[PDB]
Amino acid sequence: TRKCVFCSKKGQTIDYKDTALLRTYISERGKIRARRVTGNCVQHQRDIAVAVKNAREVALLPFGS
Amino acid sequence: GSVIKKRRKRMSKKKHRKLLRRTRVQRRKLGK
Amino acid sequence: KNVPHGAAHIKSTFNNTIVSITDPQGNVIAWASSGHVGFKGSRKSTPFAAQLAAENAARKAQEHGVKKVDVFVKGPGSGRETAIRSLQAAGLEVGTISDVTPQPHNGCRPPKRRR
């Protein structure tokens, strides 16, 4: 709960092709990290989630190691 | 409330449905 | 035969423990369970039973020349570290520990609860 980077005027854009940004918020085994730890806001967690999920379906991230 | 009132009414409900089941074919006869 | 490197698959549930040593592809070359050790009944799930099954299965695998084995565990049984430590005592010189337990993504309905 330190802060929501994404939720920053100075923050990136969440896409389902930027595999890099997502690694930051998925675990060592696909798990989408929670919001308590990651710290993100509610609106943007919802984003990382729909991203990680779409990505996995276009085969850019493991469906879980 | 207390559950005694509910299981007091439940027994009358349970007993009555049994009576309808047992007399299901006889009721359809005298109902003609 | 003669295969120096292989894989060990340990399945340990609340009722039993099955150890099978395999080639790097998956073919079974030596298997031994707690029931094949001699236990029968509720004793299959005990830590003692798993230790003997791994000891017996490793002995048969050493007869075929396996020298190093890679271990995959699966199941909630108590005899998991006991199955591993028995493979060390026989001297199979285990490789890396892993863990492959099938967890569904909310698929089929679990059976009725127990009272």
Added chain:
Amino acid sequence: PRKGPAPKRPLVNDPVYGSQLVTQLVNKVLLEGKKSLAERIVYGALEQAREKTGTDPVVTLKRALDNVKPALEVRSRRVGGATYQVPVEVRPDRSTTLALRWLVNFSRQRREKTMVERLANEILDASNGLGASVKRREDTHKMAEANRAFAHYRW
């Protein structure tokens, strides 16, 4: 108990040998208030270790001090719901006991009549450290290292 005890009797230094380590054993091997007869054996049992080997009883102190040294074994608990063993640091009182139960107390079964020459023979073997009693010390040695990697609880 529930608070913590104290060592009541003191390990008094020996009057003729000046070693509480001997004092540990003369009272550890004992009978029905027979410190008179216990005095007879405990000096009549290292007596052969003085003469049969030829080395003085001070050397008898040295050899049996270093020959039978289990000094660290394992012990059971509730852990695992079974007989899981964890190594524990033990005072050598439970170490000489490991040999005492096969010592001159048990050395009767070997065909060794002529009362105390056999009890001198065993404490002679107690000096040896390769005799009959050390087997259990070896038996628990192989048992402790049978569960060698079972110390992660470390009680």
Added chain:
RNA sequence: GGGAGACUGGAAUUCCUGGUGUAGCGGUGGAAUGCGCAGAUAUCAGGAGGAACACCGGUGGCGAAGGCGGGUCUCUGGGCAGUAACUGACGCUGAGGAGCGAAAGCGUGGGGAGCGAACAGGAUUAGAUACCCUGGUAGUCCACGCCGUAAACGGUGGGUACUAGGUGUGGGUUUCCUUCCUUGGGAUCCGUGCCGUAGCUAACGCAUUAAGUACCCCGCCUGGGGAGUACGGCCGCAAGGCUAAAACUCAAAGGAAUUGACGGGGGCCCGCACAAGCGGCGGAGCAUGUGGAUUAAUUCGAUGCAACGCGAAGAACCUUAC
């Protein structure tokens, strides 16, 4: 995660096929039934089909309520905030009426992986039409209809105005310092929680999201059983649903809280209660005392810990009561 249509993703369970591979697998407090020894379980590869969507995910969001979360596209409903441009009381409630309405259930046609009322065995038990175990059919799923009831509960009808606050959290607006990001603080609108005054309550408790202070409209109540039952009527393919009495009988039925008692409820703490250590009993012979007995009596008691070298601290007669 408001709703409907269409396409589509993978992890697992099952089954089929083919390798490796022997003698067990499964299940429980323990077992048996069962599956195998004709090649099971295990294990690797390929395939078939159906249902539900781990992580995100919670005292968080949305919908009038029921309820709603795998991804994408198409169609569509509601809500809040800001500006005050627009009509100018067009508001509120709403008897009957109409629509929506979890689950189970009914009809016609598909589908059926897992789970599984009924039904079989196996086991426990004095008995098992049960809990436990192995199997298993309607159903659970889809399309179109029907049913219309639930602890359909905040057990709290709808609208409006007022009445101390503190602290969380979900949306939308803006002043004070600015790094010029935001959990910086400040104010205001709308949700959703915890605590707490005035006040209210029989008490529990409610307390700006009232069960406080007032106004408008609707529903309902008038002791407990008989009974939400019968009769009549309406609806329904059927199950049944809606409206709804009387005779008779009882002197109570009830709501809240206090104190003990109890629990096959929980926590903590003590005792040779365990763990550390020593020695015994249980195996042999004999002393004593009980039970089972035979008999003429084998006197009367004691019966679990708290009876059994106990009333006995003296049965050759006396004792002694048979």
